Structures are given as structure tokens and as C-alpha cells.
Design an enzyme around this catalytic site. Sequence first.
Site, PDB file in Angstrom:
ATOM      1  N   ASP A 281     -80.051  12.770  13.042  1.00 32.14           N
ATOM      2  CA  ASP A 281     -80.593  12.984  11.719  1.00 32.14           C
ATOM      3  C   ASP A 281     -82.097  12.775  11.790  1.00 32.14           C
ATOM      4  OD1 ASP A 281     -80.423  13.516   8.947  1.00 32.14           O
ATOM      5  OD2 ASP A 281     -80.185  11.362   8.457  1.00 32.14           O
TER       6      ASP A 281
ATOM      7  N   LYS B 131    -100.154  -4.231  29.353  1.00 35.19           N
ATOM      8  CA  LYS B 131     -99.797  -4.074  27.956  1.00 35.19           C
ATOM      9  C   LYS B 131     -98.556  -4.896  27.628  1.00 35.19           C
ATOM     10  CE  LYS B 131    -102.112   0.105  26.842  1.00 35.19           C
ATOM     11  NZ  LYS B 131    -103.273  -0.221  27.676  1.00 35.19           N
TER      12      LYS B 131
ATOM     13  N   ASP C 178     -80.377   5.996   6.590  1.00 40.11           N
ATOM     14  CA  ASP C 178     -80.640   7.042   7.560  1.00 40.11           C
ATOM     15  C   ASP C 178     -79.496   7.099   8.562  1.00 40.11           C
ATOM     16  OD1 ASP C 178     -83.116   8.132   6.547  1.00 40.11           O
ATOM     17  OD2 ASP C 178     -84.222   6.489   7.515  1.00 40.11           O
TER      18      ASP C 178
ATOM     19  N   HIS D 296    -113.082   0.989  36.036  1.00 37.51           N
ATOM     20  CA  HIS D 296    -112.696  -0.245  36.699  1.00 37.51           C
ATOM     21  C   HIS D 296    -113.772  -0.618  37.717  1.00 37.51           C
TER      22      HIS D 296
ATOM     23  N   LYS E 257    -110.878   6.804  35.402  1.00 34.85           N
ATOM     24  CA  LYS E 257    -110.134   7.344  34.277  1.00 34.85           C
ATOM     25  C   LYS E 257    -110.291   8.860  34.284  1.00 34.85           C
ATOM     26  CE  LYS E 257    -110.361   7.832  29.226  1.00 34.85           C
ATOM     27  NZ  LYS E 257    -108.901   7.812  29.110  1.00 34.85           N
TER      28      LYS E 257
ATOM     29  N   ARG F 243     -78.175   5.261  -2.821  1.00 34.69           N
ATOM     30  CA  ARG F 243     -79.317   5.085  -1.940  1.00 34.69           C
ATOM     31  C   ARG F 243     -80.460   4.432  -2.711  1.00 34.69           C
ATOM     32  NH1 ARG F 243     -81.903   8.899   2.788  1.00 34.69           N
ATOM     33  NH2 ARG F 243     -83.194   7.165   3.545  1.00 34.69           N
TER      34      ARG F 243
ATOM     35  N   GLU G 130     -79.046  18.743  12.067  1.00 34.63           N
ATOM     36  CA  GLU G 130     -79.227  19.289  10.731  1.00 34.63           C
ATOM     37  C   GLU G 130     -79.718  20.729  10.822  1.00 34.63           C
ATOM     38  OE1 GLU G 130     -81.697  16.256   8.913  1.00 34.63           O
ATOM     39  OE2 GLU G 130     -80.340  16.033   7.205  1.00 34.63           O
TER      40      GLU G 130
END
EC number: 3.1.21.1
Lengths: 1295, 48
Positions: free
Chosen positions: A908, A809, A1251, A800, A860, A1214, A993
Site C-alpha cells: 500500500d 554514521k 496504513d 580527507h 570525494k 480512521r 493498488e
Amino acid sequence: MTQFEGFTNLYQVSKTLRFELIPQGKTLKHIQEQGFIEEDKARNDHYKELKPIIDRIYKTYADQCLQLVQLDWENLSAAIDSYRKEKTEETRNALIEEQATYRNAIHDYFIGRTDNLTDAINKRHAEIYKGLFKAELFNGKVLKQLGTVTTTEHENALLRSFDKFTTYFSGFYENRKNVFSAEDISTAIPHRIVQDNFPKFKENCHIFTRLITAVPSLREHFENVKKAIGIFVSTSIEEVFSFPFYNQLLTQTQIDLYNQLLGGISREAGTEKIKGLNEVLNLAIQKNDETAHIIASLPHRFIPLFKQILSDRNTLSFILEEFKSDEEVIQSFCKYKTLLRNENVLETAEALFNELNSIDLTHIFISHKKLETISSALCDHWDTLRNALYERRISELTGKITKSAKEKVQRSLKHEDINLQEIISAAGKELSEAFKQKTSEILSHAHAALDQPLPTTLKKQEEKEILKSQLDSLLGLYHLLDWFAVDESNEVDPEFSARLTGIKLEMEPSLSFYNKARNYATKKPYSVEKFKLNFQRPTLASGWDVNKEKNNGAILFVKNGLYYLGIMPKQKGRYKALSFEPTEKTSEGFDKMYYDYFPDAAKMIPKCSTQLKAVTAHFQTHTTPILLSNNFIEPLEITKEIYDLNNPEKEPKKFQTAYAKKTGDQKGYREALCKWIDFTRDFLSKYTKTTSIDLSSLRPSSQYKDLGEYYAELNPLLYHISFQRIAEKEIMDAVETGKLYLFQIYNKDFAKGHHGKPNLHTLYWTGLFSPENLAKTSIKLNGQAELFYRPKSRMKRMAHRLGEKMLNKKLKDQKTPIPDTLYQELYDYVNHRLSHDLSDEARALLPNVITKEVSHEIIKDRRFTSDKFLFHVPITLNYQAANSPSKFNQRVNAYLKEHPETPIIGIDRGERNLIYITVIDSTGKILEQRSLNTIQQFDYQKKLDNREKERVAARQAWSVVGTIKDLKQGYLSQVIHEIVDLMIHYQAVVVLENLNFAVYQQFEKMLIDKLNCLVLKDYPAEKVGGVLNPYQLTDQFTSFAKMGTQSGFLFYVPAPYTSKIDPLTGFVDPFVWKTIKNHESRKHFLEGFDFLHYDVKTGDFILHFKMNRNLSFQRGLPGFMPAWDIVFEKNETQFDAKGTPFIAGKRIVPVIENHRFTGRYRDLYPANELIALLEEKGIVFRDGSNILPKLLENDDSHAIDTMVALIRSVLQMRNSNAATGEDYINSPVRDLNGVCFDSRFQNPEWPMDADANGAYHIALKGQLLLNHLKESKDLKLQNGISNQDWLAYIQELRN
Amino acid sequence: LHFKMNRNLSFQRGLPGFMPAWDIVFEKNETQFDAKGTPFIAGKRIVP
RNA sequence: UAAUUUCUACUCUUGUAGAUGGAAAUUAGGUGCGCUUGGC
DNA sequence: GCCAAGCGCACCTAATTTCCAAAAGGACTG
DNA sequence: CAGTCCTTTT
Ligand SMILES: [Cl-]
Ligand code: NA
């Protein structure tokens, strides 16, 4: 009754906190002057160097012991067989004990207590073992007892570099104990022998026997492999696959030989490889003859053994020479490049290929091994040439072209080399053209490579890319030459064969060079690894206790809300140890910590009493009591009785539960327990360290059930922290003289401008030193803290500049993110550095971006642009609790039985979604459902996907690979936050699961750990969920291997029939499409159904199936329902809630090219295709009549084949196609109110994609468990859920 | 498995035939090849 | 296209949100390239 | 244009063990 | 020896 806020302080939990240390005043200057950083760095360097040298001792001894081992392995085999066959807690416990027997048996060889050896050898082994985990490693005593090897001058300098500092190897000793342990631990040699390798060896012997009984010819083949490798020369192949030989498979050298028998041996790249047994088996199966089918039906691959712990790898395969320097690569490759030009290799080549335009190509041969490579380079497909050659040859046969003739022609194409003539004749002229093109391209690239100069070094990736680009071009040519068969089997042109073989030998090193360059260029770039600081103190920060400050050099201060670490170095010269004089708490200065600790009483009390050398000594001859005076205000008596109680002839001690488990003398157990506890009380009253401690909390000794109960009440009372003011002058002066190095214990919550919520770790720390925690210990400060120096690793290039702007952003919305593809372009634009027009999309965004003028410079990776001092300090939470919980799952199951309104979160892993959550209420209805691909307006799925592409791309381009775990941890951290918040808000169970049926495995660990000790930032410290009362909702994590199907509120369920299931009925496709392969099967299949009629009201077709029917094709999962009306839904347009159209009943099925080929998928409309098929054959169906008899009334193969396909497609609930992002569930059956489920309607009361359907049924399996719990008499959860139970459960609920 | 026909009369059909004894054989279940070159497993049985 | 014990995502805020059990030792596996014999 | 069995190198990732200590013990140094 | 301080222990 029970309460959710009851789940707290159930077991102790340890954590490390990490901080930066900021030196204060003249600390840094003094540290510099004294040369502490360099001295410590050097100590680290010496350790990494001395470590392998010391390990030679361990390795050598291990082998000497293992070479002698000789056990009978039948009993262990039988334990394994019995557990395998019975699967019971009884056979499991037998196996565990048997394994322990075998481990100890091995361990006895190490410690010299095995009856298999001469008593003299045991004495040698016992001597050596006593000195393996202490400073005797350094003196060379152990090495004298071990071999006639001595140490070099440089080796001895390293050993003497740790003079008076061997304690630096404290952990190392523990690490090496871990190698030799008889315990059931992964780190240990006996465990490796008994539990890892033996089972594999056992399996291999079985596999061998089945193979050589079914196909005896294999015995000879395998014997010959052994001969061709030249190993196990005096051992038969039968003997190699028998239990006695396992005694010669314990040392690394033997394991490596066994693995090479299995796996074979390579030489230089480009040389034929010697085959192992596994390769021989593979080849035989790939003959696809009748023998192959038989061999493949059996196990046909031997399991290689794992390595021995610690031991050095060795291989009979050739290993390449490494390149050491950037200069060594460039010099070598330049010499060989300049040599290639002086040899005129490219002009030789260009002429060889021009001969091909004139010479007789009948005597020019292509190697059969390269025929498909050439078909791929120069032709449409890999099979183009082979097929061309085949078709031309079978046309050259005479007479009846039989199947046997056709087969011989195929075989020939694999066994004999082909002349160019026949290739050109069989393919087109486009082959001769493509060859010229491909020939010139390769030479063009070759030319360019040899003409192009190499770079000066290989620091930057652009230089690497030049090196690689060139090698690739030389390799391209080496391949091209390797197309031609030079073998003397054929009648090749002699000159051509000579001139070609000339350039091949000159091009051969290109392969060696390629591999060496890559092997060197893909190395990780040197990093600056942080190292431990001792400041010349062998036990720095080992423990905080006030008695130990003189030795350990570490103290804590607090002043005006900031924390400080005092370090007291041993500096060059002679100084009096620093000591602090407390003062009136008015006076300005530092509150110094005063830490009083008596560590675990179970060990410490014997240490300081019964296990004293003088006591042990005395009770070896004498029977009388012994009185201790030293460190006792009043003498502590020890009787033979007491001594014996803690020093037994054999474990266990009378006062351990295991004795009561064994002897059953529950009258004896308690008589001991009471004697010992009384003894600890006598100790504690008299030992200087504990005499003043108020033990009045503790009940009479007889009232204690187990000892662990007594130490758990005792130990808390043996730890106290207090503070006393130290005058400012005293501290500041000590920094000035250098007797004290003062560091601020720092993280960013202590910055001038901090004004938000602190880190959880900051909470733990300030909670530790809060008044409430000092009055009553919830969190304890632990010893074995560590200091580190971390040098700067990234250059201080400011990210900078003053004039530059930075671009948020997110837009002015503070919610809507700028697209990735537009962010960089807009950044450049607002900083006036775009070299071209602004994207239209980007120009549209422009008036809603937020830029910020860089007011102050910010670097940075600033943290890494400067050398830094770091501090790691362990704490323990829930200190009042035991080290391990008691019956944790039962406490939960009790809460659950008493709270049947508990909701459930199903999590899931999805096909199109990294993680998907569905929350259900206790009646099975969905409360919430969402994908977690995007969290905080960030698409972690896309990011992970791209990153893993970059990594692959990197590996291929010899650029820096880097990490993905950092980004994974990032994502999962957020997922964890969301789940935890849901769990607390709903007071819900969480259901994952079971993977025994990546992000998800990582997720599991992170989630379990979190809920081992859950603190919520916003909660007050004295509330449950506060830093002084962590929630604990999962069971204490030990290891994955030890984890059951329940970890507290976390439940694991099997994955099957959770996605491909109707959420309205529980219908699942009940057919194995393996068992429907033939005409006669397809017919019987159709005959299984009662009717197929058209319903003129709806336009659907209805296929009736009784479940007590066509049982030959069912998976054996009847479920609850007797019959299903399978529905071919009319292909009409329906509309979702948003308003989007979709076609009902649509299926998405793989497009199939003849035989078996499926790349893309296609949209099918079953109802319409059935209408097509009926109208084809003129069957009347709009009457409502049964169609099935009419379909198979004439036995049309197409008609009943088409049917079968359509039926199967309908049952395919499905239907997904990544191209378009369809992943829906459409059910083939109507529910009780007459509706087929389609997820595409996007009704939020139900799953909204496949899903989500998964997440829901995972939740519901958890609900099954919970429902079975309430009905249960016990607090035990059922172990597993069989598909059948699942289906009968859910089908009954929904019908 | 060696059997004399004069034993186990209780279990026989009263048909002593011509041979006094038989060596009954359990054949190693190994691959064999027929004339056409198709294999099979020796001693295989097909039971209800 | 930036600040962190450290990670990820951020930038009203010289910093924000969430996470974060270290250190040592060992073993297993994975991705990529090269090569060998083979199969479609 | 993939795949099977396998060998060699580069690096990345993940699992599982130990410790999280004051004081007994004894080596070393005038 | 007597003290100091690293090593080893329960
Ligand atoms: Cl499924
Ligand atoms: Na903050």
C-alpha cells in the site's frame, strides 16, 4: 504438477552493461597523438548544430502535406461514441481499426498514395519520401524538391563535415521514421492527429453545444473573444466547433491559434491580458449568481490541443528579451540603478507619502484591485478592510436596509476605487501607523539596495543573492506605488497624480529587470556531457561478427580473468589492416573472442535471397526460375512461387497467421508455411555463412504450427562464440605501433582489493563468458556497443587530509545511527574544529563513536575528478526463449490453481508511510507487516521530505535545484530488494493498488522490471534464480498503457474500502453525508435506526441499524450483513501491549469555525458527549430504555443535530492527527466474539495502524481474485472488483 | 409538430374543441428569466 | 562527513551492501517565480 | 491567504518509440 | 574497370 522453478526462460530480455575502459600501455599516448578525442568531440558538436537545420526539411514537408489534408471525421466520432457507450471488446476493436484507417489516410498524404490529390502531386510526395531517411538529406536534392530556399555557407560546411560519415545519423533516421509512421505509436504525427487531438476537438464541440443551448448569450461572448484576438476571421464560432474545421487544425500554426482562442494572449508584464474562452467561462461562474450555477453544472472548460510532432512553437503573447552574460546583467542593472539615483526617485517617493499626512485624502484613491493586498500588508487579515468598509457603508443607508441594499453595497466595493479618508475612518488609526511603518521599511530597503554595490560576476550563489535581494527591494516599491489609482475616473489631486505617475514610469523597468535577471540567473550551470567515440570508424562496435572486424574495429580478449576491449582505429597515414594469427593454447597471451552470428533469419534470409535487386528485377518481366551462385557453395534456385510467397500483391503473406485469421484457408497457410520453411532450409545449406551449421535439431517443416515457432528454434543455432589464443608478442607489438588500442573492461569487482559479492552486472558478464554459457547460450553478447569519453566534471579537492579523522554514521553498536542533528557537530569536534561547546546529547554519544585516521588520501567524487573512457555493451538473457512470452498469465494462473497455499504480499501507499507491506497466509491471517519508511537504519521518508523542501527553497532563492530521482531510485532499490526476497521466500503473489482508481508509480515500474528477469546473487548459475536461469515472475513489460490488472504474479486491485474498513467484520460507513444536509433529512436519518439503548454492563451505547433501511442515504453498498449494532464505546482507559495508555472510542475530528473552516483537529469522546446531551435534556438512560424516540419527541434542532454529528463521528473508523502521529482504526461495531477492533491495542495478529490496514485489505482483495480463480473453469482472472463484491465477500468471511 | 384534430380520433377523448389544428412545440431548452430575475430552463418537464 | 560503470546506503575491509537497459528522438506533465482578470 | 481561469520564463521528471546487424548495394577513387 | 569502404537494407 507445476513448479515455482518452472518460471524461467519464458521470454528474452535485453540489458545494457556499463563499464569503464582503462587504456593499456601506449594506447592513451597514441590516442592523444592522433587527435581522436578532439575529432569525436567536434563531430558531436557538429551534430547538435546540424540537427535543427536538417529538421527544417522534415517540418516543412510535414506541413506542406498536412495543409492539403481533408477528411470526414464522422465515422471516427461514431467509433468513439460506440466504444464509450458499450465498453466491449467488439466496439474497442472497431475503434482500433477505425483509428488505423484514419492514420493510414493521413500517412497516404506523406507517401503520395492518397486519392484526394492529383497524380502529379503524389509523384512529388513519393519522390521526396524516398529520400527523407538516408544520405539524400545532405546532398540538397530533397531541399530542391521542397522550396526555393538554399543553404548558407556555414550550413554547407556542417553538411560537408559529415562527408563519408553520414552513418552517424543512423538512429536519427529511425527517430524521424517514428514521426511519419502510420503505426499506433506516440511518436507519430498521424497518431497525434487521430488519437490525441481529434478526441479533444470532438469533446470541445460537444461542450460548446451544451453551453450555447443552455445559455445562448455565451455564443455572442465567445464570438467576441475570437474578434478581440483577431484570429479565424473568416470562420464562424459555430464553424470553429464543428468537425469540418478540424481539417484546418493539423499544422502547429493553427493549433497555436486554436489554443490562444481558448487561453488568450498576454503582453508586457503589468498590462491587461486578453481573455480566452476558458477565462470568460471562469469569470461567469465566479459571479455566483443563478446563471453561474447553471453554467457550472455543465462542462465549462475547453481542452487545448497537443502540439504537432517536431513543429516549432509560436505564440502571440509577448516574450521578453533574454540576458546573455553575467556582465550584461550587472552592467544594465548598474546603469538603471545609477539612473534611479540621478532621477532622485526615492526622495520624490518619501515626499509623496508625507503629503498623505497633510493633503485632503478625499482626493487620494486606492485601486479596488489592490484593496485585499493592502489589507494583508497593513492589517490583521485579507478581509479586514473590505469588511470594515462594508460595515461603515451599510450604516450610511436610509430606511429599511433590505437584502438588495446590502448586496448593492458589496457590488460597489468591487467596482469603485476607495479614498484613503474612508479607509482610515472605517479601519482604526492603526492603519495610518502601519502604513507609515510599511512605507519606511520599503524605502529603507530600497535605499540600501541602491547604495549597495553589485558583485563582479554571478558565479557564486552569494552574488546571485545580492542581485536578487536588491531587485526584491525595488519590486517592493513598485508594488507600493501600484497601490494607488491614478485613473481619471476619480477626482484625484492633480499634482499628486502627476508626481506619482512620474515615479511609476521611472520604476516600471524594475519588473522587466526582475523577470530577466531570474530568467537568466536560474539557468542550469554548464556541464561536461560525455560524447560518443568513433576513432574515425563510422560503424565502430556496430557488430562483433568475425567477418565484420575489418569494418567495425572492435574485438574482445580475456587473459587471466580480466577482460579487454581491442579497438582498431583508422589512423593518420597508410597502414595494413591488423590481423591476428592464432597459436598453440600453451603459448602465453590473450584469448581473442571469435563471434559468428547470422542475425534474425526472418529478415536476413530474404535480404540475401528473394529481395535481391537482381531477383526482384528478373521476376518483374520473367516467369522462369533464377539461380544464385555468389555466396552459395551450390546454386540457390528461386522460383516465381517462392518469390510471390514473400512478395505478395497485398499483405498478408500466405505463411503468416494473419492470413489464416483472414482467409481461413488453413489448408493454404500450411502449404505455404511448408514451402517457405523448406526454402529457408535450402538457403541455409548453401549460403557460405550458414552452410556448416548443424541444423539437425530442427523438425520436418510440416510439423511447425506458426513461422514464429520455427524461427525461435532456428535463431539460437545461428549464434556461436569461441576463443583462440593470440601470442602476447603479437598484441603488445600492436599496441606499441598503435594499430591496436587496448582497454581493460573495468568495474570495481576487478580491483586488487575486491573480496566481497560482485555486482549483478559483473555476474551477467562472467556468466556470459563462462564455459557453460559458451556450450549452450543462455546469455548472448549483442552488437551496437558504444564507447564514450567523459571529461572531468568536479575539482580534485581531497575530502580527507592526512591528519583528519572520519566519523562513522553508526556507533560502536554498528547498528544505532548518530542523529542527523548531532553528526556534523561531532564530526567537527573529533577533528578539533568546533568553535563552541559540545551539545550535551553529543557529549553523551562521544564515547561510543568510531573515528578513522585517514591512512591514504581518498577524493570525494574521485570518479569525476579525471577524464574517463566508458563502454556500454548490450546483452540478451534467456536467449533460447522467444522474443515475447506466450499466455504468460495463464501459466501463472495454472500454477496458482494447483498451489492454493500460496501466500500474498499486499503493498500500500500510505498517508503516513511511503510504502507499507502486509503479508497474509492463504487463510487471510497476517504473517508479517511493516512500514518501509526506514530501511537499513536509514529514514528515507525524512530524507525525501527534506530534499523536496530544499528543492522548493532553492527554486525560490534562485539557487541550484538538483535532482531527487537519484535518492528515490536509491530508496526504491532497497524496497525492491526486500519485496523480491519476500516473494522468493514465501513463493507469494504481490498485490498493488491500481492508480487508475510518485514513489509508488516509480516502485511499480522498478518492481515489474526486476521480476521480468530476476537473478539472485547467492544462487549458483545452473540453479533457477542463477545468472543462466533468471526467474521471470511478471509478464514482459511493454508499456503502462498496455498493462492489464495482472502481470504474472503481480496483481492490481482497486483502492476503495481497504483502509476505512473494520478488519474483524468488514464493516464500512454506509452513508453519504451529502444526502444529510437539512433538518428534515437529519430527522429521517434518525428514524432509520430501530433503537438506541445504553448497556449498563459495558457502558457503551448500542445503535441498531437494519441494512434494508434508510436506503436514501446509503452509497448503495449493502454488503453481506442485514444489520449492524453500532457501538458508542465507553470512554475508558485501555492499554496496548507495550503498556502505553489510550482512551477507547476516541475520535479525531476537524475543528470547524463558523460556516466551513478547518485548519486544526480536536479529540472527541462520543459516548461522554452523548451522556452530556441526555443529562442536559433530563432523559433517563441507565434503565436500558430506547433513547431515540425521546430525542426526537419534541423536534429540538440542537439535540438531533448533535446526535447526527456524534453518529457520523462514531462511524469515522480512521482517526489521524499528524501533530501527534495518531493514525488508528477503531471500529464502531463488535465482531462475533464481542470485541470492537482498536488498532491502538497493537495486537500483532492484526493491522497496527490505518496504513497497515490498507496493505492487509489490498492483500485480501488479491485473495478474492485467487479464490475466484480456483472456482473458475478457466485460467482467466476476473477483471476488476466492484466495491459491492468486495464487501459481500469479506463480510461473509468474517461473520 | 403539426396536428389536425380530425386525425387520430381512435386516440382522442371525443373533444374536438374549437381549433382544427395545433402547432405543438418542442421548446429549445434554454435559460429564461422570471420577473424577480430567477432563471429556469424552457420546455422542461418533470416526469415519473 | 569519503572510494563506485552509475545510483543509494555504508566504512571490519585501498573498499562493503543492495540496485542498475543503454543511446537517440519525441511528447506530456510537474514544481518555482512574475504578471492578468476575477472569487471568497 | 488562500483559490479559479490564463499568459511568460527557469529547471526537473516520466512516458514511449527506434536500434541493439551481417551483408547487399553502390559511391568513390586511382 | 577493380578494389575499398561507407550507406542502406531485410
Ligand atoms: Cl478506504
Ligand atoms: Na562489493
